[PDB]
Write an enzyme that holds these catalytic residues in place. Structure first.
Site, PDB file in Angstrom:
ATOM      1  N   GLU B  95      -8.388  35.729 -12.049  1.00 29.59           N
ATOM      2  CA  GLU B  95      -8.336  34.629 -13.019  1.00 29.59           C
ATOM      3  C   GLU B  95      -7.263  34.861 -14.018  1.00 29.59           C
ATOM      4  O   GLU B  95      -6.523  33.958 -14.286  1.00 29.59           O
ATOM      5  CB  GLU B  95      -9.642  34.351 -13.741  1.00 29.59           C
ATOM      6  CG  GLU B  95     -10.726  34.015 -12.740  1.00 29.59           C
ATOM      7  CD  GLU B  95     -12.095  33.916 -13.313  1.00 29.59           C
ATOM      8  OE1 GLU B  95     -12.615  34.822 -13.906  1.00 29.59           O
ATOM      9  OE2 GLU B  95     -12.679  32.765 -13.090  1.00 29.59           O
ATOM     10  N   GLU B 104     -18.354  30.121  -9.063  1.00 28.88           N
ATOM     11  CA  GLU B 104     -19.029  30.696  -7.926  1.00 28.88           C
ATOM     12  C   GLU B 104     -19.771  29.738  -7.061  1.00 28.88           C
ATOM     13  O   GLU B 104     -20.363  28.801  -7.555  1.00 28.88           O
ATOM     14  CB  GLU B 104     -19.804  31.953  -8.281  1.00 28.88           C
ATOM     15  CG  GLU B 104     -18.778  33.102  -8.586  1.00 28.88           C
ATOM     16  CD  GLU B 104     -19.032  33.644  -9.949  1.00 28.88           C
ATOM     17  OE1 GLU B 104     -18.546  33.167 -11.030  1.00 28.88           O
ATOM     18  OE2 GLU B 104     -19.971  34.581  -9.791  1.00 28.88           O
ATOM     19  N   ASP B 111     -22.410  20.024   6.930  1.00 29.60           N
ATOM     20  CA  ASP B 111     -23.233  18.810   6.999  1.00 29.60           C
ATOM     21  C   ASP B 111     -24.709  19.149   6.990  1.00 29.60           C
ATOM     22  O   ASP B 111     -25.115  20.317   6.920  1.00 29.60           O
ATOM     23  CB  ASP B 111     -22.880  17.970   8.224  1.00 29.60           C
ATOM     24  CG  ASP B 111     -23.000  18.794   9.465  1.00 29.60           C
ATOM     25  OD1 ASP B 111     -23.828  19.687   9.579  1.00 29.60           O
ATOM     26  OD2 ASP B 111     -22.004  18.605  10.309  1.00 29.60           O
ATOM     27  N   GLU B 131     -10.535  33.351  -1.572  1.00 29.91           N
ATOM     28  CA  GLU B 131     -10.992  34.423  -0.727  1.00 29.91           C
ATOM     29  C   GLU B 131     -10.418  35.707  -1.273  1.00 29.91           C
ATOM     30  O   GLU B 131      -9.206  35.842  -1.367  1.00 29.91           O
ATOM     31  CB  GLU B 131     -10.430  34.238   0.694  1.00 29.91           C
ATOM     32  CG  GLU B 131     -10.880  35.329   1.715  1.00 29.91           C
ATOM     33  CD  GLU B 131     -12.381  35.567   1.734  1.00 29.91           C
ATOM     34  OE1 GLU B 131     -13.169  34.599   1.227  1.00 29.91           O
ATOM     35  OE2 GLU B 131     -12.829  36.577   2.234  1.00 29.91           O
ATOM     36  N   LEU B 132     -11.286  36.615  -1.649  1.00 25.32           N
ATOM     37  CA  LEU B 132     -10.897  37.886  -2.213  1.00 25.32           C
ATOM     38  C   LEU B 132     -11.274  39.055  -1.367  1.00 25.32           C
ATOM     39  O   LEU B 132     -12.445  39.389  -1.307  1.00 25.32           O
ATOM     40  CB  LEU B 132     -11.825  38.201  -3.380  1.00 25.32           C
ATOM     41  CG  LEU B 132     -11.519  37.818  -4.815  1.00 25.32           C
ATOM     42  CD1 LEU B 132     -10.118  37.364  -5.161  1.00 25.32           C
ATOM     43  CD2 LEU B 132     -12.636  36.972  -5.415  1.00 25.32           C
ATOM     44  N   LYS B 133     -10.330  39.779  -0.820  1.00 23.72           N
ATOM     45  CA  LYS B 133     -10.721  40.976  -0.123  1.00 23.72           C
ATOM     46  C   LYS B 133     -10.487  42.183  -0.976  1.00 23.72           C
ATOM     47  O   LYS B 133      -9.458  42.317  -1.657  1.00 23.72           O
ATOM     48  CB  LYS B 133      -9.831  41.366   1.061  1.00 23.72           C
ATOM     49  CG  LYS B 133      -9.374  40.231   1.901  1.00 23.72           C
ATOM     50  CD  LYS B 133     -10.023  40.277   3.254  1.00 23.72           C
ATOM     51  CE  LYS B 133     -10.803  38.999   3.602  1.00 23.72           C
ATOM     52  NZ  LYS B 133     -12.285  39.128   3.633  1.00 23.72           N
TER      53      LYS B 133
END
Lengths: 225, 228, 228
Positions: B95, B104, B111, B131-133
């Site tokens: 951030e 979050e 669906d 997406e955080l690895k």
């Protein structure tokens, strides 16, 4: 060449022991004999670094920027700590030479290349002495000898001779489990083909490393404070 | 039809809004479902032919078995744990660095069917997903840091594209975090939606679901028994 | 000539009737021996050329080490513990369902040479041998459950035939149990003796044995020292 090491890392080589935490600090970012096979790996064709090569390269750069190295093969290492002395003695008894301890040796002041011999022999040879984890691998060596020994292991032996400026090395195995025939070894002679490989490729690897450190803002040696 | 919390709660008794990544509920909600992390297997193709590749059969059996046992084994617990531990550290440094705000989001289903879903690492103020690895090895962080996009393995791209397919967004941030890094421990890129992937999902996925339905019936189970 | 309890007793000091699977003796009795579970390695061929495959040379080394050290490292421990935990419940359930009655059969040698053996999961009222596994992943269980015969790994097949070769039988049960399945956690088949396979052992096995023999002599050992 302690003053250099010392001045450089604040560590006193004399006090070091294979496994010493320092032992480890001194290897960080360094191209060692156990891993050089990766550096010399070649593509079947093309100029592209094989995978195992990019990967080692990536591992090395991280040692530099994090100041640490993850642990590997815990139990294998432990097995070896466990039997090295017995192996040593026997080897001696048997080979007829006296072996003495060798800290860690760098090729030059740059400290970018090094090896950690298992011993230094009275007849002038270095010693590589393993206590394989599986008796299966001892059998393999014992029966096939020279041509059994792996490429990764040949590169290792040769790189040690390159770093130490030596002409021959013992490559031995010990297995306390064998009812008999538990120790086996051979003598390896310095090979200029390997020599020429190192002279050519190793320096090229170092330069790319530096370029990469530069790209991200680090400089070789930061790991040593 | 559109997925609602109301639907999840009535079918499974779980309150999505209270779910947290890694929770027990979080895991249950994923049993039997086709997730972004694994879709790569679904869309795998043989060099020639029409035969499902091993990886593909293999994930098929895996999904089925989750349905009929209602559990899932753990793998590389260590890396799992690592990634789970550093995630918050990663989010907040992202951030700061990107300048966006992150919210979050548990899990998101495509669906009302509950057959397809993803678990974003966040939802960004600019509308992009995240997406955080936290690579278990620093070697990997270095790989991406230096190699960027092209460094990122196929599985990752499929994962990123599926997240977009499921949520219907146009781009997604992909980042790496390494707490061991003295400085610079966060690096990231932006990935744009790709129609070629959208389409593939659109065709293949639905078919994979049908096969599953056929196999379960054959041994007398019905999709959903896992939430009983 | 045929094997008998007297031979064993005389050659190794052990009471074969008293042996239980997983017994210390049980393990002793297997040292240096080519078993049903490992035979796949001995039968392995190269796509072309008469050169041994890596897995072959490896097993080959492993077994020699067994002879010269008189011990064997512990392996696939988690999998063994799992099967150990469920073998009972699996047997009982198999019985019920198949109708057959099952009986224990420690270990059996093909002959007095003690070079070749098997350790069946049980002996069946109908004179069939029994291989009863508790697969470690539910996925594998599903694999078999749904695809039966043609789904059984080569190795499993080899293990099956090897067992008939050793015991001289015509058919064997191949079954699986999964305590995790909410329902349908048992499935099995019946495998018939295959001559193409018999011929194979008949040919290869003996040569493999000769080679071990050469190798051991080359380092001053002889087979059986493991039982000294």
């Amino acid at each position: 060449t302690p003053d250099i090491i010392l001045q450089r890392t604040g560590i006193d080589v004399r006090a070091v022991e294979q496994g010493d935490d320092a032992w480890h600090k001194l290897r960080l970012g360094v191209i060692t004999a156990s891993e050089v096979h990766n550096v010399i790996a070649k593509p079947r064709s093309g100029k592209k670094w094989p995978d195992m090569k990019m990967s080692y390269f990536h591992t090395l750069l991280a040692e530099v920027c994090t100041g640490v190295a993850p642990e590997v093969n815990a139990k294998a290492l432990a097995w070896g700590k466990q039997y090295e002395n017995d192996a040593r003695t026997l080897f001696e008894f048997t080979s007829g030479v006296n072996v003495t301890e060798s800290p860690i040796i760098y090729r030059d002041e740059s400290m970018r290349t090094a090896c950690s011999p298992d011993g230094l022999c009275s007849d002038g040879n270095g010693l590589e002495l393993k206590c394989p984890f599986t008796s299966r691998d001892f059998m393999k060596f014992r029966l096939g000898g020279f041509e059994a020994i792996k490429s990764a292991y040949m590169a290792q032996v040769q790189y040690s001779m390159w770093v130490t400026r030596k002409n021959a090395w013992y490559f031995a195995n010990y297995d306390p489990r064998m009812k008999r025939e538990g120790l086996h070894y051979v003598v390896i002679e310095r090979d200029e083909k390997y020599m020429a490989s190192f002279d050519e490729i190793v320096p090229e690897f170092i330069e790319k490393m530096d370029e990469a450190l530069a790209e991200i803002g680090f400089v070789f040696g930061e790991q040593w404070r």
